[PDB]
Coordinates of C-alpha atoms in Angstrom, one line a residue:
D1054 CA 0.0 0.0 0.0
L1055 CA 3.1 2.2 -0.1
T1056 CA 2.5 4.7 -2.9
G1057 CA -0.9 5.6 -1.5
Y1058 CA 0.7 6.4 1.8
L1059 CA 3.6 8.4 0.2
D1060 CA 1.0 10.5 -1.7
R1061 CA -1.2 11.0 1.4
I1062 CA 1.8 12.5 3.3
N1063 CA 2.8 14.3 0.2
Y1064 CA 6.4 12.9 0.3
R1065 CA 8.4 13.1 -3.0
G1066 CA 11.3 12.1 -1.8
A1067 CA 14.0 9.3 -2.0
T1068 CA 13.0 6.0 -0.7
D1069 CA 16.2 4.3 0.7
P1070 CA 16.4 3.3 4.3
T1071 CA 18.6 6.2 5.5
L1072 CA 18.6 8.8 8.3
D1073 CA 17.8 11.6 5.9
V1074 CA 14.7 9.8 4.5
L1075 CA 13.6 8.9 8.0
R1076 CA 13.7 12.6 9.0
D1077 CA 11.8 13.5 5.8
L1078 CA 9.1 10.8 6.3
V1079 CA 8.5 11.8 9.9
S1080 CA 8.2 15.5 9.0
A1081 CA 5.9 14.7 6.1
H1082 CA 3.7 12.3 8.3
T1083 CA 3.4 14.7 11.2
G1084 CA 2.6 17.6 8.7
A1085 CA -0.1 15.6 7.0
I1086 CA -2.0 13.1 9.2
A1087 CA -3.7 14.5 12.3
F1088 CA -3.9 13.1 15.8
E1089 CA -7.6 12.6 16.7
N1090 CA -9.8 10.3 18.7
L1091 CA -13.1 10.6 16.9
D1092 CA -13.4 6.9 16.8
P1093 CA -13.3 6.3 20.6
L1094 CA -15.3 9.5 21.2
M1095 CA -18.1 8.2 19.0
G1096 CA -18.0 4.7 20.7
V1097 CA -16.0 3.1 17.9
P1098 CA -13.1 1.0 19.3
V1099 CA -9.5 1.0 17.9
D1100 CA -9.2 -2.8 17.7
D1101 CA -7.5 -3.7 14.5
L1102 CA -3.9 -2.7 14.2
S1103 CA -3.0 -4.6 11.0
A1104 CA -1.4 -2.8 8.1
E1105 CA -4.6 -3.0 5.9
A1106 CA -7.0 -1.6 8.5
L1107 CA -4.7 1.2 9.5
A1108 CA -4.0 2.2 5.8
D1109 CA -7.7 2.0 5.0
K1110 CA -8.4 4.5 7.8
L1111 CA -5.4 6.8 7.9
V1112 CA -4.6 6.8 4.2
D1113 CA -7.6 5.8 2.0
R1114 CA -10.3 7.4 4.3
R1115 CA -8.2 10.5 5.1
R1116 CA -8.8 10.2 8.8
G1117 CA -6.3 10.8 11.6
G1118 CA -5.7 8.5 14.5
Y1119 CA -4.1 8.1 17.9
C1120 CA -0.8 6.5 19.0
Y1121 CA -1.4 2.8 18.0
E1122 CA -2.8 3.9 14.6
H1123 CA 0.1 6.4 13.9
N1124 CA 3.0 4.4 15.0
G1125 CA 1.2 1.2 13.7
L1126 CA 1.0 2.7 10.2
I1127 CA 4.5 4.3 10.1
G1128 CA 6.0 1.1 11.5
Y1129 CA 4.7 -1.0 8.6
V1130 CA 5.9 1.7 6.1
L1131 CA 9.4 1.8 7.5
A1132 CA 9.7 -2.0 7.6
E1133 CA 8.6 -2.2 4.0
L1134 CA 11.4 0.3 3.1
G1135 CA 14.1 -1.8 4.7
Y1136 CA 14.3 -0.2 8.2
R1137 CA 14.2 -2.6 11.2
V1138 CA 11.4 -1.6 13.4
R1139 CA 10.7 -2.8 17.0
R1140 CA 7.4 -1.8 18.7
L1141 CA 7.7 -0.6 22.3
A1142 CA 5.1 0.3 24.9
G1143 CA 5.1 3.2 27.3
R1144 CA 3.2 4.9 30.1
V1145 CA 2.2 8.6 29.7
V1146 CA 3.4 10.9 32.5
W1147 CA 2.6 14.3 30.9
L1148 CA 2.3 17.1 33.6
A1149 CA 2.3 14.4 36.3
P1150 CA 4.4 15.0 39.5
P1151 CA 7.0 12.3 40.4
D1152 CA 4.6 10.8 43.1
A1153 CA 1.7 10.4 40.6
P1154 CA 0.0 6.9 40.4
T1155 CA 1.5 4.5 37.9
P1156 CA -0.2 5.1 34.6
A1157 CA -1.3 2.2 32.3
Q1158 CA 1.0 1.1 29.4
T1159 CA -1.2 3.0 26.9
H1160 CA 1.4 4.4 24.5
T1161 CA 3.5 2.8 21.8
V1162 CA 6.6 4.0 20.1
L1163 CA 9.2 2.5 17.7
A1164 CA 12.8 1.7 18.0
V1165 CA 14.2 2.0 14.5
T1166 CA 17.5 0.9 12.8
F1167 CA 18.7 1.0 9.2
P1168 CA 21.8 0.1 7.1
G1169 CA 24.7 2.2 8.3
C1170 CA 22.8 3.6 11.3
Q1171 CA 25.0 4.7 14.2
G1172 CA 22.6 3.3 16.8
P1173 CA 18.8 3.0 17.2
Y1174 CA 16.4 5.9 16.8
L1175 CA 13.1 6.6 18.6
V1176 CA 10.3 7.3 16.2
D1177 CA 7.0 8.6 17.6
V1178 CA 4.5 10.3 15.4
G1179 CA 1.6 9.4 17.6
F1180 CA 1.9 11.3 20.9
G1181 CA -0.4 14.0 19.6
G1182 CA 0.3 17.5 20.8
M1183 CA 3.8 16.9 21.8
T1184 CA 5.0 14.2 19.5
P1185 CA 8.5 14.7 18.3
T1186 CA 8.6 15.5 14.7
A1187 CA 12.0 14.1 14.0
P1188 CA 13.5 10.6 14.7
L1189 CA 15.5 11.0 18.0
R1190 CA 18.8 9.2 18.8
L1191 CA 17.9 6.5 21.3
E1192 CA 20.5 7.7 23.8
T1193 CA 20.4 9.4 27.1
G1194 CA 21.8 12.8 28.2
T1195 CA 21.9 14.3 24.7
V1196 CA 19.7 17.4 24.1
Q1197 CA 18.0 16.9 20.8
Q1198 CA 16.6 20.1 19.1
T1199 CA 13.9 19.5 16.6
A1200 CA 11.9 21.9 14.3
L1201 CA 9.8 22.7 17.4
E1202 CA 10.9 21.8 21.1
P1203 CA 14.2 20.2 22.2
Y1204 CA 14.0 16.6 23.5
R1205 CA 16.0 14.5 25.9
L1206 CA 16.0 10.9 27.0
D1207 CA 16.9 9.9 30.5
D1208 CA 17.5 6.5 32.2
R1209 CA 14.6 5.7 34.5
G1210 CA 14.6 2.1 35.9
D1211 CA 14.4 -0.3 34.0
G1212 CA 13.6 1.9 31.0
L1213 CA 13.8 5.4 29.6
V1214 CA 11.8 8.6 30.0
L1215 CA 11.2 11.0 27.1
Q1216 CA 11.3 14.7 28.1
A1217 CA 10.8 18.0 26.2
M1218 CA 11.2 21.6 27.0
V1219 CA 7.7 22.9 26.6
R1220 CA 7.6 26.6 26.6
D1221 CA 10.2 27.1 29.3
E1222 CA 10.2 23.9 31.4
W1223 CA 11.5 20.5 31.0
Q1224 CA 8.5 18.1 31.0
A1225 CA 8.6 14.4 31.2
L1226 CA 6.3 13.0 28.4
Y1227 CA 6.2 9.2 28.8
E1228 CA 8.4 6.5 30.3
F1229 CA 9.1 3.3 28.2
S1230 CA 10.9 0.0 28.2
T1231 CA 13.1 -0.8 25.2
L1232 CA 11.8 -4.4 25.2
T1233 CA 10.0 -5.4 22.0
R1234 CA 6.2 -5.9 22.7
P1235 CA 4.1 -8.4 20.7
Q1236 CA 1.4 -7.1 18.5
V1237 CA -1.2 -8.7 20.9
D1238 CA -0.1 -6.6 23.9
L1239 CA -0.5 -3.5 21.8
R1240 CA -4.1 -4.5 20.8
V1241 CA -4.9 -5.0 24.5
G1242 CA -3.6 -1.5 25.3
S1243 CA -5.5 0.0 22.3
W1244 CA -8.7 -1.7 23.4
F1245 CA -8.3 -0.2 26.8
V1246 CA -7.6 3.4 25.6
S1247 CA -10.4 3.3 23.0
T1248 CA -13.1 1.7 25.2
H1249 CA -12.4 2.2 28.9
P1250 CA -14.9 4.6 30.3
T1251 CA -12.1 6.4 32.3
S1252 CA -10.0 6.9 29.1
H1253 CA -9.2 10.5 28.2
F1254 CA -9.9 9.4 24.6
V1255 CA -13.3 8.3 25.5
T1256 CA -14.3 11.2 27.7
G1257 CA -13.2 14.1 25.6
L1258 CA -12.1 15.3 22.2
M1259 CA -8.4 15.6 21.3
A1260 CA -6.8 16.6 18.0
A1261 CA -3.3 17.8 17.0
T1262 CA -1.3 18.7 13.9
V1263 CA 1.8 20.5 12.9
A1264 CA 2.5 23.2 10.4
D1265 CA 5.5 25.5 9.7
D1266 CA 6.3 26.2 12.4
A1267 CA 3.4 25.7 14.8
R1268 CA 1.6 23.1 16.8
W1269 CA -2.1 23.1 16.4
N1270 CA -3.6 21.4 19.5
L1271 CA -7.3 20.9 20.2
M1272 CA -8.8 20.0 23.6
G1273 CA -12.6 19.8 23.4
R1274 CA -13.5 23.3 22.3
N1275 CA -10.2 24.8 23.3
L1276 CA -7.9 25.5 20.3
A1277 CA -4.3 26.5 20.9
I1278 CA -1.8 27.5 18.3
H1279 CA 1.7 27.2 19.7
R1280 CA 4.2 29.2 17.6
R1281 CA 7.9 30.0 18.2
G1282 CA 7.3 33.3 20.0
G1283 CA 3.8 32.8 21.5
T1284 CA 0.7 30.8 21.9
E1285 CA -2.7 31.8 20.5
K1286 CA -5.7 30.4 22.3
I1287 CA -9.3 30.3 20.8
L1288 CA -12.5 29.2 22.5
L1289 CA -14.6 27.6 19.7
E1290 CA -18.2 28.8 19.8
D1291 CA -20.2 25.6 19.4
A1292 CA -20.1 22.0 18.3
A1293 CA -20.6 23.2 14.7
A1294 CA -17.3 25.3 14.8
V1295 CA -15.4 22.4 16.4
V1296 CA -16.4 20.1 13.5
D1297 CA -15.5 22.8 10.9
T1298 CA -12.1 23.1 12.6
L1299 CA -11.6 19.3 12.6
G1300 CA -12.2 19.3 8.8
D1301 CA -10.6 22.6 7.8
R1302 CA -7.5 23.0 10.0
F1303 CA -6.9 19.4 11.0
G1304 CA -7.5 18.0 7.5
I1305 CA -9.8 15.2 8.9
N1306 CA -12.4 13.6 6.6
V1307 CA -15.2 14.1 9.2
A1308 CA -17.9 12.7 6.8
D1309 CA -16.3 9.3 7.4
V1310 CA -17.4 9.4 11.0
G1311 CA -21.1 9.4 9.9
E1312 CA -23.8 12.1 9.8
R1313 CA -22.5 15.5 10.8
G1314 CA -25.4 15.9 13.2
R1315 CA -24.4 12.9 15.3
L1316 CA -20.7 14.0 15.6
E1317 CA -21.9 17.5 16.5
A1318 CA -24.4 16.2 19.1
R1319 CA -21.6 14.0 20.6
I1320 CA -19.1 17.0 20.7
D1321 CA -21.9 19.2 22.2
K1322 CA -22.6 16.7 25.0
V1323 CA -18.8 16.1 25.8
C1324 CA -17.4 19.3 25.3
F1325 CA -19.9 21.7 25.8

């Protein structure tokens, strides 16, 4: 399904398994396919992580997705290109203090290698609003400036913790083990996050995309545009404007979700 995907992320673009191509794929992907949880919000589970089902939705149907869908899809792409891809699981610690309760293992990221690589790279195009938009060296200590925030991995345990400087503060994003996880364990986690009544992807709306050189982040009716020298915040007026924004700014094929009236009613109930 490769050409369809390359067209959808508008990549144009050498295709060898190199570090340059990996950077360009990650920028293109993050620039093109939104993060969104319209499926779980509308009571539709994310239960099929195969290459076909994720391409059908994120490519053919011009929908976005969440972590399992994003890193699912890009993982299959990269493998097809001649990268070696290992799927990893993580726990989200965003904004949480050190004494927070242990979060579920609800995130998935990739450890990626390729011919002539200098060591493994972390690829994560699925952590919505703060997803790194470059592959990162899978090494600790190093401060890694991207097109947006700088990132840094730290040894914690047992595993690693990804941090970024968000506005003016170093923020831990998620902790993860470098142990490969079976596809079945990912499906268990995706089931949880897409169906559990306490899941943040069940109880509210979340969408995120990147431009030059801005993060566009949506939380319910709260739209934030995070640029280099400032953040613009917009309170969307009504469920109708939220859906327009999902289609227009986030590039999501909202018609796929069903009748516009039902999406709106759902967003109004949530959200509103």
